[PDB]
């Protein structure tokens, strides 16, 4: 069924599973016409695909084109999401498969079960789990990629950089949604937090900054500080 | 006209005759129903006083045999029986007429209910439904489950109506996902019209027995079909006009014969509000959406 606090060392078992969050898919600036009404302009967005126990990230890249001429853009938006997703799941080796894809929000829970019906052993699942993951493109290296895109494209990525040879994915994961919800919540101060610091750097091949396990502590702090903080203003706490 | 008799009476029981009823008490000089208008289907239902646990009855057409009710005391019901001996026949109807011991069809010269409600169902369509081909007649139950039940226990006892699964590959073609989910036109004129139905007609009236047997029978699966039928309409963008100007005088007639107080469990809310002001369908079914709104207020 659905996915929620109760069960959630089942997202580390050994089942391969993904996460799919369709909040950057369809992404628009609104603005004034010449006349006085207003119009939308869609930038290139992104399907955040993502296996919570390895870190593998399948980016798909939306590109504007691909709603030229279309119209219910939000309905289609999920449709084309789910279309992605299927298209990724039968590029896959039967052996890397999933046997669970867990959707964040419960309108793409019908899209994606039409799309994936030559596929009845995988199972389609919500989550009560509110989870970060439309603050993926306040990762630098994801925004830009998707940004520079001028067709749609494919990206790999592992969010967890080389975090897995230290700490257990349970871990790897709970860093992983407090540094996006720490980026949800105020990006200016968290990406200071990442990088006030000159002499620790991210790696060419890596998305965040090379901390030691100390480090990552005192950062993992300051943003459980920054959340709490920003909490007290919103809530006049 | 035409005549069931009954052998006799042991056991009090509610007896209906298409959309009439009446009480027999236990042992009362009844001995069956005369004045049977030729032309139609009819079915035969029962109610036990004792225990109205099972609703049971026999759809039938008095033109293909010459068909009666005998209690059986060993299985506890009054069972439909053809007699092959015409002339016997004949002569045990005459005997009961003579003594008056037959009540007669309630039909009003001006009433056609029935006929609005059977116009295309055929014996030989719930025959296929209803598979025990020993019988001209067809026996239906309260309890018995649909193979579509029967997929998510006995299949020799089951109704077998078309099964419609919005979320199947039936009704969805490989590359028009969305299209063929958010309007339903392949699946109805293709898949089921064309291919499965052949027409309109055995559409409709499998549609009609499954709403007649949902609320003579309070057969739960049969409901369920009823409105999946429904559903499948109004859910498409293109239907042939003829069907859905003939499908709102349908719906009227089984939302004005439905009972007032059946409504709260043979009328599924989320269809009927999706059929009537959301579907592609919203603003042709005039009459039903007026009976429905003067009807039955509350579910809307
Ligand atoms: N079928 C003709 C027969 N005379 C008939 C007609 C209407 C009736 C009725 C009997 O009994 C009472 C209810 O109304
Ligand atoms: N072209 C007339 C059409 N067959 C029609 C439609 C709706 C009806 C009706 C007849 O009389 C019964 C109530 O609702």
Known sequence: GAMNSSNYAELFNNDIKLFVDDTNVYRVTVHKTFEGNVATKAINGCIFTLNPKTGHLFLKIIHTSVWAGQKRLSQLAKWKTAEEVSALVRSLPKEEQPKQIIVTRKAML????????????????????????????????????VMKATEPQMVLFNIYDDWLDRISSYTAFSRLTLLLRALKTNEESAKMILLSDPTITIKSYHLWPSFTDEQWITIESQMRDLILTEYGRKYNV | ??????????????????????????????????????????????????????????????????????????????????????????????????????????????????????????????????????????????????????????????????????????????????????????????????????????????????????????????????????????????????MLDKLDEILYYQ????????????????????????????????????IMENKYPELL
């Not at chain 1, 596929?119 to 699942?125: D, E, W």
């Not at chain 2, 005998?70 to 015409?86: A, F, I, T």
């Open chain 2, 1 to 242: 006209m035409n005549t069931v008799p009954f052998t006799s009476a042991p056991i009090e029981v509610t007896i209906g005759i298409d959309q009439y009823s009446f009480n027999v008490k236990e042992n009362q000089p009844f001995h069956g129903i005369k004045d049977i208008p030729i032309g139609h289907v009819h079915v035969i239902h029962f109610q036990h006083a004792d225990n109205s646990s099972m609703r049971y009855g026999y759809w039938f057409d008095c033109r293909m045999g010459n068909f009666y009710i005998q209690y059986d005391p060993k299985d506890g019901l009054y069972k439909m029986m053809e007699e092959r001996d015409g002339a016997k026949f004949e002569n045990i109807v005459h005997n009961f007429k003579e003594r008056q011991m037959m009540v007669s069809y309630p039909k009003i010269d001006e009433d056609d209910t029935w006929y609005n409600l059977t116009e295309f169902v055929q014996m030989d369509k719930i025959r296929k439904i209803v598979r025990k081909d020993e019988n001209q007649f067809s026996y239906v139950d309260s309890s018995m489950t649909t193979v579509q039940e029967n997929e998510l226990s006995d299949p020799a006892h089951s109704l077998n109506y078309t099964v419609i699964n919005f979320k199947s590959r039936e009704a969805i073609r490989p590359g028009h996902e969305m299209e063929d989910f958010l309007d339903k036109s392949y699946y109805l004129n293709t898949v089921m019209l064309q291919g499965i139905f052949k027409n309109s007609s055995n559409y409709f009236g499998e549609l009609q027995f499954a709403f007649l047997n949902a609320m003579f029978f309070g057969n739960y699966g049969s409901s369920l079909q009823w409105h999946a039928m429904i559903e499948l309409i109004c859910s498409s963008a293109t239907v042939p006009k003829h």
């Open chain 1, 110 to 145: 019908d899209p994606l079960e039409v799309h994936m019906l030559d596929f009845p052993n995988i199972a389609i699942r919500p989550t009560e789990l509110r989870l970060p993951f439309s603050a993926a493109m306040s990762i630098d290296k994801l925004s830009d990629v």
């Open chain 2, 255 to 290: 939302i004005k014969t439905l009972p007032e107080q059946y409504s709260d469990i043979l009328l599924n809310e989320r269809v009927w509000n999706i059929c009537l002001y959301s579907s592609f369908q919203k603003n042709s079914l005039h009459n039903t959406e007026k």
